[PDB]
Amino acid sequence: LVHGGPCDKTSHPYQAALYTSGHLLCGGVLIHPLWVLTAAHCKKPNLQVFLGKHNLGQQESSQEQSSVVRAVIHPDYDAASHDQDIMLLRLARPAKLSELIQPLPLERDCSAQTTSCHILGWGKTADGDFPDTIQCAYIHLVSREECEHAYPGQITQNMLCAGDEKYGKDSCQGDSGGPLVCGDHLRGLVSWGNYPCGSKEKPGVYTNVCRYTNWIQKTIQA
Ligand SMILES: *[B@]1([O])O[C]([C][N]C2=[C][C]=C(C([N])=[N])[C]=[C]2)[C]C2=[C][C]=[C][C]=C21
C-alpha cells in the first residue's frame, strides 16, 4: 500500500492475511463466520487465512488461523483482463468472533455514491519493502471515464476505480483481494492497477462487489 500510514489497530476487524509457502500473498475480507472474500488470482497452493492480525512479524493474542476447505473462483474469471476477479474461501473452522475479528457487510446497491473510501493491507510500500504493520489510505471512487483513458479498453461493469488525486494513495503487490470499504460496507477488492503504484494519473482498479450478491449467496448456501 503506497503513500499510506499504519492503521488504527481497532479499525480493521474484517481483515484477512492470506499466506502461501510461508509468505504473505494476498489480503482478504471476512464476510461470514465461515467465508473469506478475495481476488481470484490469489488461488495459490494450501492457502492459510490469518484473521485478527495487525503486525505480521509478532504473534498476537487476538490472531486466529484457518486452512481452506474450498476455494470458489467466479466461473467467468479472465486472468488476462482480471474480469470477474472474485474468489470465495471456505474456512476450516467458523472464525472465533471477537472485537478484533468481525465480518464486514457488503454494499449490494450498485447505485450507492459514497466516494469517500479507504484501502488497507500488507502490500509493498513507498520504500519498496513489505510492512509488518498493516497500512491504511483514505481514497476516492475515480470516474468510469478517467479509467477509460488511464486504461484504454480494460474496464467493465465488474470493475470499480479508486484513488487520490493529491497524494496518489494506491494498492500494490501483496494487497490483492484486500477490501475497498465505503460507508462501513465492502464496495470492492484490490484487483490490479498501475506500475509503479500510485493513483495520481492512473487509479487503482477494484472488483465491483455489488455485481456479485447472488453469486456469493448461492455459494454460501450450497
Ligand atoms: B497481488 O497481491 O498483486 C498482484 C497485482 N498487484 C497490484 C495490485 C494493485 C495495484 C494498484 N492498485 N495499482 C497494482 C498491482 C497480482 C497477484 C497475483 C497473485 C497473488 C497476489 C497478487
According to the 3-state scheme, what is the secondary structure of the chain? Answer: CECCEECCCCCCCCEEEEEECCEEEEEEEEEECCEEEECHHHCCCCCEEEECCCECCCCCCCCEEEEEEEEEECCCCECCCCECCCEEEEECCCCCCCCCCCCCCECCCCCCCCCEEEEEECCCCCCCCCCCECEEEEEEEECHHHHHHHCCCCCCCCEEEEECCCCCCECCCCCCCCEEEECCEEEEEEEECCCCCCCCCCCEEEEEHHHHHHHHHHHHCC
CB 1 within 8 A of CB 129: no
Is 184 noted as a catalytic residue in this protein?
Answer: no
Q: 25 vs 42, 66, 110, 117, 161, CA distance in Å?
A: 7, 15, 29, 23, 22
Of 99, 93, 114, the closest CA to residue 160 belongs to: 114
Is 41 noted as a catalytic residue in this protein?
Answer: yes
Q: How far is the CA of 137 from the centre of ligand 1 (A)?
A: 16
Of 52, 53, 47, the closest CA to residue 69 belongs to: 47
**Grid cell for residue 63:** 490472531
| Residue of minimum CA distance from atom 4 in ligand 1 | 173
Note the resolution in Å, 1 decimal: 2.3
Residue 143: CB atoms within 10 A of its CB come to: 13
Q: How far apart are CA 203 and CA 208, in angstroms?
A: 15
CB 87 within 8 A of CB 196: no
Angle at 15 between CA 172 and CA 115, to 5 degrees: 65
Q: How far apart are CA 188 and CA 37, in angstroms?
A: 10
CB of 204 shorter than 6 A to ligand 1: yes
Angle at 150 between CA 185 and CA 7, to 5 degrees: 35
Q: How far apart are CA 78 and CA 186, in angstroms?
A: 22
| Residue of minimum CA distance from atom 11 in ligand 1 | 193
Q: 9 vs 5, 6, 144, 207, CA distance in Å?
A: 12, 9, 33, 26
For residue 23, the number of C-alpha atoms closer than 13 Å in the C-beta half-sphere is 8
Q: How far apart are CA 139 and CA 17, in angstroms?
A: 21
Determination approach: X-ray
Give the residue, out of 190, 191, 195, 207, with the most ligand 1 atoms within 8 A of its beta carbon, to mutate for a pocket test.
190
Task: Match 455489488 to its residue by C-alpha cell.
Answer: 210
**Domain annotation for the chain: domains and CATH numbers:** 1-12+104-210 (no CATH), 13-103+211-222 (2.40.10.10)
Of 116, 131, 123, the closest CA to residue 180 belongs to: 116
Considering the candidates 3, 41, 74, 185, report the single residue annotated as catalytic.
Answer: 41
**Grid cell for residue 188:** 470492492
Q: How far apart are CA 53 and CA 141, in angstroms?
A: 27
